Amino acid sequence: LAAHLAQAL
């Protein structure tokens, strides 16, 4: 999940 959010940055 973290990567699916972190992609914003």
Q: What is the 3-state secondary structure (H, E, C) of 1-9?
A: CHHHHHCCC
> How far from each other are the two terminal CA atoms of the chain, in whole angstroms?
14
What is the distance between the alpha carbons of residues 9 and 1, in angstroms, rounded to a whole number?
14
> Which residue bears the tokens 């990567």?
3
Resolution in A: 0.8
Tokens of 7: 């992609």
